[PDB]
Amino acid sequence: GRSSLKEIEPNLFADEDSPVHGDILEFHGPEGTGKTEMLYHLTARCILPKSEGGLEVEVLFIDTDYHFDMLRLVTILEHRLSQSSEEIIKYCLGRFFLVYCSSSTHLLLTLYSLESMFCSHPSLCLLILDSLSAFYWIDRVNGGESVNLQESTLRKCSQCLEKLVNDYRLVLFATTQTIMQDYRPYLCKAWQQLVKHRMFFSKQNQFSLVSRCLKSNSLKKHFFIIGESGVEFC
Amino acid sequence: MQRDLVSFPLSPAVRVKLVSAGFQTAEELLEVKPSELSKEVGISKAEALETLQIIRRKCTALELLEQEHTQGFIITFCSALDDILGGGVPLMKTTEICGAPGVGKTQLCMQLAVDVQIPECFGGVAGEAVFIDTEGSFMVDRVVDLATACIQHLQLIAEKHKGEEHRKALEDFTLDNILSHIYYFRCRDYTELLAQVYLLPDFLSEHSKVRLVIVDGIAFPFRHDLDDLSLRTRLLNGLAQQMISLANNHRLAVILTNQMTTKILGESWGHAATIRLIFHWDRKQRLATLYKSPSQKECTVLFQIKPQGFRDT
Amino acid sequence: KKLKRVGLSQELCDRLSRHQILTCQDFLCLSPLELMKVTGLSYRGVHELLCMVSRACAPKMQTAYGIKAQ
Amino acid sequence: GVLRVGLCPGLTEEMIQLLRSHRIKTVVDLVSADLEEVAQKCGLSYKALVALRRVLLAQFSAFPVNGADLYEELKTSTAILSTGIGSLDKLLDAGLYTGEVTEIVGGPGSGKTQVCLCMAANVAHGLQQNVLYVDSNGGLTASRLLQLLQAKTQDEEEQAEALRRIQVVHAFDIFQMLDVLQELRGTVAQQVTGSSGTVKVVVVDSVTAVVSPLLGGQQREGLALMMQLARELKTLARDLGMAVVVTNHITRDRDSGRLKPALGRSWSFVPSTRILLDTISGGRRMACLAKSSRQPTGFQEMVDIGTW
Ligand SMILES: Nc1ncnc2c1ncn2[C@@H]1O[C@H](COP(=O)(O)OP(=O)(O)OP(=O)(O)O)[C@@H](O)[C@H]1O
Ligand SMILES: Nc1ncnc2c1ncn2[C@@H]1O[C@H](COP(=O)(O)OP(=O)(O)OP(=O)(O)O)[C@@H](O)[C@H]1O
Ligand SMILES: Nc1ncnc2c1ncn2[C@@H]1O[C@H](COP(=O)(O)OP(=O)(O)O)[C@@H](O)[C@H]1O
Ligand SMILES: [Mg+2]
Ligand SMILES: [Mg+2]
Ligand SMILES: [Mg+2]
């Protein structure tokens, strides 16, 4: 049974005591606001051993910007651990997975193959997708004036994700970018009908996080700072 | 390495049809004959032939160092100003000369048109000049004074070299021959200047001996009304990469004269010149400030204009 | 000056007119990427069109010797 | 992409034509379709379709790699390249990193080209590894490189050896530089044991010179080209382990007096780190991080181009 969202992050989901069944969340904000820092915070919580405050559940990470900094992750894990050593961090990393996707078609091919991963790793109960909006500009040109043609591949990936999230009760933390102009939707409808919570990031170092929950149309606000130890919720 | 069709210069409409049929990388289209590729997609045989042509179709620092020495610098008869520039106005690079009107930019432009024709055996470059005049300041009779004066100066050295080959290059160097290699171009509006700049890469390929291109006036004296929309697409893109590439493939020097700047036209303009000089007054005495350069630190010098032409103080 | 006098194909001229382009001046103000969109031509093909259009307005060359001799 | 003979064993025209007739053209449709409706109906062997689908899916998809295994490779292959300028090296925390896209910002004559030449000379002489300098504005000057080399050593053989280790290329339009980058990628792919080359650094002088013309009007063809260039640089960096360096202009947002890059919101997400250069004197340039994944921003300091 997947752990409830209120356990993954008590400082964001303080009213989600029920076990999760295929929820989806999204991050949105300008550059250098902390979207990738949060994914390190959540990733650290889920791979650390239970003796050190973690949950001990594997994680899968999908990258399409090539911005994943291995050193920045490891420096966090050594800090958080009470007594960090090389032979300890090895096991902490042993529950982390990574893939790179170069184009929407490559991503779609990867998704159809990821069906085999979860059939072999039942503990894999988290899924992260960085910069879902990487191929927007390229694809919007190859599709011509016909909107249906512009979004064809992005729609298929959306239909694939929803199928994976429910067959195995995962949590998807997608990430997007502020490319046009608070909020300005540009992705397809086949995807925007899936997101439950949409969270926004701002800059002033103090970072302010605003959460909107379309499940109940409730708005909140949080604060946090980024230090050498990672994210700290005020 | 799976080149992607968005990186190729294929026409936008044809690319849409190609991708819709399922083609993603250029490596797929290499084997298919043009006859079949015209049927799988809704394009004509001519397009099928043009497309497959695009799909299929250097020097180290040591080598560039050798070429840099050999390619002579253009002198200005001002040993002071020529000293800060490193020897003279260089080839394969763009230069700019800013300054308020009435300071002598056109005099320096004219003096360079003559100094590019000096024979090589005196340390010159032996090239012809192109003078794209936008302000209509060209005065041929002035070149005569700058020309005959230079020959007299050139004559005063050959007598000390005695029987060297200078006595033949001096015969080759004459007033009529000098004036028979200065090409004029009168532009009266932005459209004419754009048209001329578009055709210049052709005019230069026909005359391999040209070694200096001058653009007397990058900003028209009366940019007004709707013309301001025409100025864009010339300072943008046009006069930043057309002049650099033209001045490099043909191995020549380009000089742009500017009038707006007057102190020590678009924010991105400042990056459009490899070198930039500024002329201004001080106590009613001319100055030649160097403001930007990737090989010479900022410095200032003095100069004066005499009937004999550009000269030191 | 109007484009149809320059020497462009009649068919193409209509494709331009449907975008509210009538004079050579309007034609020159567009960048190469725009002209590709509004013509269907490849990158090199647009340069040939630009050369053709400019060849009807560029100034006439004049040697310095000639002007001195009037 | 589109199906073709030889893309994998077991494919022929007499079957590819059947698939094409049945509205199955590319690999995506083949793997996203229903095989039984195509096998029992329309007369195709179910086992053959399954085998073909699995082979294609395996061949044209990513394969997840554990974190522990990747950590060793990263720690062993990653390296830090000194930039020569001692102070700026401290600001960057030992300098450039292999596998990331670095960017430099600054107005006219703020030392963007001088810093690039300094890194090129230092990498050519100290570490003695090759360098590719993609020049888009004629900034490169052979004499300045020789001068900066002389500032380090006086031997004439060492200088001659160093100057032959720097390749120079020219690209004054978006397509030429894309061709150059793809050619470099192909050369590195083919040459697996040619250590005589093995470019370890890339310097793209004024990446804003070949992108600013493409942007303009209501068209969107320029954005796709810029993003294609960004993907090219990203793959060059990450996949091949070459410390790419880029140079960009600056501008002031109309709403406030702050400085920012010039290529817009889409570009700002590309670089993995940014260094802003500004003037407070011929030299005495001031540097301060504006973007990084390992240090706080806004750490202002001083450098002097008069010596470097
Ligand atoms: N170790 C650290 N100590 C202090 N501040 C840090 C540290 N690492 C990163 N930061 C700061 O925290 C922020 C990091 O943001 P992050 O890496 O999450 O970017 P992002 O939102 O993914 O950006 P983008 O999408 O534009 O690439 C930046 O302000 C960076 O300066
Ligand atoms: N030999 C030198 N000694 C000292 N300073 C020098 C030297 N050569 C150049 N400079 C300085 O370098 C400055 C030019 O900087 P640089 O060539 O790096 O500009 P840039 O960033 O490429 O500019 P642009 O935006 O126009 O491309 C000159 O103004 C001068 O101050
Ligand atoms: N034959 C000459 N002898 C001395 N001075 C001259 C001669 N011809 C022009 N000048 C000086 O040059 C100045 C004009 O410079 P000009 O060519 O207009 O510069 P710019 O082109 O930058 O405006 C005048 O003030 C004039 O005094
Ligand atoms: Mg990020
Ligand atoms: Mg004048
Ligand atoms: Mg430069």
Coordinates of N, CA, C and O in Angstrom, one line a residue, chain A residues 2 46-47 56-62 94-99 114-128 164-165 167-171, chain D residues 64:
Chain A
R2 N 0.7 2.1 -1.0 CA 1.5 3.3 -1.1 C 1.2 4.2 0.1 O 0.1 4.3 0.5
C46 N 12.5 9.7 0.1 CA 11.9 8.4 -0.3 C 13.0 7.3 -0.5 O 12.7 6.2 -0.6
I47 N 14.3 7.7 -0.5 CA 15.4 6.7 -0.7 C 16.2 6.5 0.6 O 16.8 5.5 0.7
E56 N 12.3 4.4 2.3 CA 12.9 3.2 1.7 C 12.0 2.7 0.6 O 11.6 1.5 0.6
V57 N 11.8 3.5 -0.4 CA 11.0 3.2 -1.6 C 11.8 3.7 -2.8 O 12.2 4.9 -2.8
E58 N 11.9 2.9 -3.8 CA 12.6 3.2 -5.0 C 11.9 4.4 -5.8 O 10.8 4.7 -5.5
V59 N 12.7 5.0 -6.7 CA 12.2 6.2 -7.4 C 12.7 6.1 -8.9 O 13.8 5.5 -9.1
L60 N 11.9 6.6 -9.8 CA 12.3 6.7 -11.2 C 12.3 8.2 -11.6 O 11.4 8.9 -11.3
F61 N 13.3 8.6 -12.3 CA 13.5 10.0 -12.7 C 13.7 10.0 -14.2 O 14.5 9.3 -14.8
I62 N 12.9 10.9 -14.9 CA 12.9 11.1 -16.3 C 13.3 12.5 -16.6 O 12.7 13.4 -16.1
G94 N 21.4 3.1 -4.6 CA 20.9 1.9 -5.2 C 19.4 1.8 -5.4 O 19.0 0.9 -6.1
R95 N 18.6 2.8 -4.9 CA 17.2 2.8 -5.1 C 16.8 4.0 -6.0 O 15.6 4.5 -5.9
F96 N 17.7 4.5 -6.8 CA 17.4 5.7 -7.7 C 17.7 5.3 -9.1 O 18.7 4.6 -9.4
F97 N 16.8 5.7 -10.0 CA 16.9 5.3 -11.4 C 16.8 6.6 -12.3 O 16.2 7.6 -11.9
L98 N 17.4 6.5 -13.5 CA 17.5 7.7 -14.3 C 17.4 7.3 -15.8 O 17.9 6.2 -16.2
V99 N 16.7 8.1 -16.6 CA 16.7 7.9 -18.0 C 16.7 9.3 -18.7 O 16.4 10.3 -18.1
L114 N 8.6 1.4 -20.4 CA 8.6 1.4 -19.0 C 7.6 0.5 -18.4 O 7.6 0.3 -17.2
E115 N 6.6 0.0 -19.1 CA 5.6 -0.9 -18.6 C 6.3 -2.1 -18.0 O 5.8 -2.7 -17.1
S116 N 7.5 -2.5 -18.6 CA 8.2 -3.7 -18.0 C 8.9 -3.4 -16.7 O 9.1 -4.3 -15.9
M117 N 9.3 -2.1 -16.5 CA 10.1 -1.8 -15.3 C 9.3 -2.1 -14.1 O 9.7 -2.8 -13.1
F118 N 8.0 -1.5 -14.0 CA 7.2 -1.7 -12.8 C 6.8 -3.1 -12.5 O 6.5 -3.4 -11.4
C119 N 6.7 -3.9 -13.6 CA 6.4 -5.3 -13.4 C 7.5 -6.1 -12.7 O 7.3 -7.2 -12.2
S120 N 8.7 -5.5 -12.5 CA 9.8 -6.1 -11.9 C 10.3 -5.4 -10.6 O 11.0 -6.0 -9.9
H121 N 9.8 -4.2 -10.4 CA 10.2 -3.4 -9.2 C 8.9 -2.9 -8.5 O 8.5 -1.8 -8.7
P122 N 8.2 -3.8 -7.7 CA 7.0 -3.3 -7.1 C 7.2 -2.2 -6.1 O 6.2 -1.3 -6.0
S123 N 8.3 -2.0 -5.5 CA 8.6 -0.9 -4.6 C 8.6 0.4 -5.3 O 8.6 1.4 -4.6
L124 N 8.8 0.4 -6.6 CA 8.9 1.7 -7.3 C 7.6 2.4 -7.3 O 6.7 2.2 -8.1
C125 N 7.4 3.4 -6.4 CA 6.1 4.0 -6.1 C 6.2 5.5 -6.3 O 5.3 6.2 -5.8
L126 N 7.2 6.0 -7.0 CA 7.3 7.5 -7.4 C 7.8 7.6 -8.8 O 8.7 6.8 -9.2
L127 N 7.3 8.6 -9.5 CA 7.7 8.9 -10.8 C 7.8 10.4 -11.0 O 6.9 11.1 -10.7
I128 N 9.0 10.9 -11.6 CA 9.2 12.3 -11.8 C 9.5 12.5 -13.3 O 10.2 11.7 -13.9
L164 N -0.5 4.2 -17.1 CA 0.6 3.7 -16.2 C 0.3 4.1 -14.7 O 0.5 3.3 -13.8
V165 N -0.2 5.3 -14.5 CA -0.4 5.8 -13.2 C -1.5 5.0 -12.4 O -1.4 4.9 -11.2
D167 N -2.7 1.6 -13.4 CA -2.4 0.2 -13.3 C -1.5 -0.1 -12.1 O -1.7 -1.1 -11.4
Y168 N -0.5 0.8 -11.9 CA 0.3 0.8 -10.7 C 0.1 2.2 -10.0 O 0.3 3.2 -10.7
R169 N -0.2 2.2 -8.7 CA -0.6 3.4 -8.1 C 0.6 4.3 -7.8 O 1.2 4.2 -6.7
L170 N 0.9 5.0 -8.8 CA 2.1 5.9 -8.7 C 1.7 7.4 -8.4 O 0.5 7.7 -8.4
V171 N 2.7 8.2 -8.2 CA 2.5 9.6 -8.1 C 3.5 10.3 -9.1 O 4.6 10.0 -9.2
Chain D
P64 N 16.8 2.3 -18.6 CA 17.2 3.0 -17.4 C 18.5 2.4 -16.8 O 18.7 1.2 -16.8

